[PDB]
UniProtKB/Swiss-Prot annotation, chain A:
Signal peptide: none annotated. It comes from Saccharomyces cerevisiae (strain ATCC 204508 / S288c) (Baker's yeast). It comes from the Eukaryota. The chain holds residues 1836 to 2069 of 2413 of the full protein. Changing residue 104 to A: Reduced growth at 30 degrees Celsius. Strongly reduced growth at 16 degrees Celsius. Changing residue 105 to K: Severely impaired growth. Reduced growth at 30 degrees Celsius. Strongly reduced growth at 16 degrees Celsius. This is Pre-mRNA-splicing factor 8. Residues 7-237 are annotated as: RNase H homology domain. Functions as a scaffold that mediates the ordered assembly of spliceosomal proteins and snRNAs. Required for association of BRR2 with the spliceosomal U5 snRNP, and the subsequent assembly of the U4/U6-U5 tri-snRNP complex. Functions as a scaffold that positions spliceosomal U2, U5 and U6 snRNAs at splice sites on pre-mRNA substrates, so that splicing can occur. Interacts with both the 5' and the 3' splice site, as well as the branch region. Has a role in branch site-3' splice site selection. Associates with the branch site-3' splice 3'-exon region. Also has a role in cell cycle.
Curated annotation (Swiss-Prot), chain B:
Keywords: Cytoplasm, mRNA processing, mRNA splicing, Nucleus, Phosphoprotein. GO terms for cellular component: cytoplasm; U5 snRNP. The modification Phosphoserine is found at residue 236. Present with 7330 molecules/cell in log phase SD medium. Component of the U5 snRNP complex that is required for spliceosome assembly and for pre-mRNA splicing. Involved in splicing pre-mRNA of the A1 cistron and other genes that are important for cell growth. It holds the Pfam family AAR2_1st. The modification Phosphothreonine is found at residue 257. This is A1 cistron-splicing factor AAR2.
Length: 237, 300
């Protein structure tokens, strides 16, 4: 059924599963027209499809050309997401296809379900968790590859860099969601925290800086403090 | 004008015939129902004074034979049976009328209610949904389950309605996932009307029979079937104009005939608000929409 705090450790067993997040598929700017009316302009987008056990990220770039001459775009985005997730599953060898797909927004259930009719033994599940995967375009190298794209394109990443050489999936995913939660509530400070010290660099094949174990502890503390501050501000507590 | 005699009434029971019903007391001298209008199907049904669970009954057409009722004390219920001996049957029927022990089918001459609820119901199609080919009449009760319900257990006792499932391969063409799921016209007209039902009268007939089983026996799967066949039309952008107008009449007399106190289990809130107000066909059910507002605005 729905994924919540209770059944949380199921993410890290040896059943292949993916998260699908559609929040950045259809991205717009809003502006005024010569005559004073409002208009949208689309920019490039991405499906965020992630295996939380291994870190592998299947970043499917959604080029503005896909919207050309289409109506009801926010509804289409959901069907285009599902079509692309389904083609990704079909492209994977049988033993790599997932047993479950977990959608971060419940409106994706019916479109994915319909696109996956060919895979009845793959369970499509909602979640009650409030995951921060929309902040993915706050990771500099992911936003860069999305914005530069000139055609539809799939790009692969390990969202955990090399962390699994030293920590568990459970711990890797808790670090990833804490970094992304921080980036979501206050992007400017989050990124300040990550980069203040020019002597800690990002390897060319990595997304995050190359912190030592001790430096990750200080960072995680700094990201926690950020998130709680911003909460007091929001709610006057 | 046809007759359905009863051998006796050994147990206190409420007897229904179509949309009429009578109370009969234990060993009251009751010997049948006369003046039943030839030309339509009919349903005679039962609810014992002691077990207000399990309403049951029999679908029949008097052109297809001479039928009568008889209590079975082993099985504990009123059974319909057929008499093949024509003379013996008229002899029973005449002697009971002479002794005036039969109630008269109580139709008002202005009243087209039963015709309007049964316009497209044919006995031959009923017998394909309730398969029991050794009888010319059909038994249904409160508890019988549908073929779709069984897939999610005794098949001899199943209601073999046509299976409708919006999230199925049958309903969704590969490559038209989004189109066919938002606009079921292809599932309706090609798969169901042209493919399975062959024409809309058979479709309307299954629809109407499903409603009558929900109404008279509270059969929950029939209620599910009726709402599904309605939803499939209302969710199709392209429906023949004749079907739309006929559907508005069909639903109106169904909503009109429903007992007021049952509107809570028998009317699916989501389906009706979608059909009358969101679907492609929101504006094509003017009569149905008007009687639902003036009689059950709570639901909406």
């Amino acid at each position: 059924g729905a994924m919540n705090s209770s059944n949380y450790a199921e993410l890290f067993n040896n059943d292949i599963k993916l998260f699908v997040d559609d929040t950045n598929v259809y991205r717009v700017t809003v502006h005024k027209t010569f005559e004073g009316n409002v208009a949208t302009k689309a920019i490039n987008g991405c499906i965020f499809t992630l295996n939380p056990k291994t870190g592998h990220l299947f970043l499917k770039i959604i080029h503005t050309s896909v919207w050309a001459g289409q109506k009801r775009l926010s509804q289409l985005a959901k069907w285009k997401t599902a079509e692309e997730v389904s083609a990704l599953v079909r492209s994977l060898p049988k033993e790599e296809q997932p047993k479950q797909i977990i959608v971060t927004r419940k409106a994706m259930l019916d479109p994915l379900e319909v696109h996956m009719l060919d895979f009845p033994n793959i369970a499509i599940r909602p979640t009650e968790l409030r995951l921060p995967f929309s902040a993915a375009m706050s990771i500099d190298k992911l936003s860069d590859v999305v914005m530069k794209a000139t055609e539809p394109q799939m790009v692969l990443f390990n969202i955990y860099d090399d962390w699994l050489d030293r920590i568990s999936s459970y711990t890797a995913f808790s670090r990833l969601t804490l970094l992304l939660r921080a980036l979501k509530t206050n992007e400017e400070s989050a990124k300040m925290i990550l980069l203040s010290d020019p002597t800690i660099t990002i390897k060319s094949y990595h997304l995050w800086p190359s912190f030592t174990d001790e430096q990750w502890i200080t960072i995680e503390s700094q990201m926690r403090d950020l998130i709680l501050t911003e909460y007091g501000r929001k709610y006057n507590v | 004008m046809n007759t359905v005699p009863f051998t006796s009434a050994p147990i206190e029971v409420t007897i229904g015939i179509d949309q009429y019903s009578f109370n009969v007391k234990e060993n009251q001298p009751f010997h049948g129902i006369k003046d039943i209008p030839i030309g339509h199907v009919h349903v005679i049904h039962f609810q014992h004074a002691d077990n207000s669970s399990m309403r049951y009954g029999y679908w029949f057409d008097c052109r297809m034979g001479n039928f009568y009722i008889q209590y079975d004390p082993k099985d504990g219920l009123y059974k319909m049976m057929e008499e093949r001996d024509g003379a013996k049957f008229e002899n029973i029927v005449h002697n009971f009328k002479e002794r005036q022990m039969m109630v008269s089918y109580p139709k008002i001459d202005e009243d087209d209610t039963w015709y309007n609820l049964t316009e497209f119901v044919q006995m031959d199609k009923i017998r394909k949904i309730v398969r029991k080919d050794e009888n010319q009449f059909s038994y249904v009760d409160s508890s019988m389950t549908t073929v779709q319900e069984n897939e999610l257990s005794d098949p001899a006792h199943s209601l073999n309605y046509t299976v409708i499932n919006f999230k199925s391969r049958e309903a969704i063409r590969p490559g038209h996932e989004m189109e066919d799921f938002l606009d079921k016209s292809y599932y309706l007209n090609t798969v169901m009307l042209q493919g399975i039902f062959k024409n809309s009268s058979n479709y309307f007939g299954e629809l109407q029979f499903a409603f009558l089983n929900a109404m008279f026996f509270g059969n929950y799967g029939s209620s599910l079937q009726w709402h599904a066949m309605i939803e499939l039309i209302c969710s199709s952008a392209t429906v023949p104009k004749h079907m739309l107008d006929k559907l508005d009449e069909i639903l109106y007399y169904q909503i009109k005939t429903l007992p007021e106190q049952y509107s809570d289990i028998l009317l699916n809130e989501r389906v009706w608000n979608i059909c009358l107000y969101s679907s492609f066909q929101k504006n094509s059910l003017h009569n149905t929409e008007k009687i639902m507002e003036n009689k059950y605005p709570e639901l909406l």
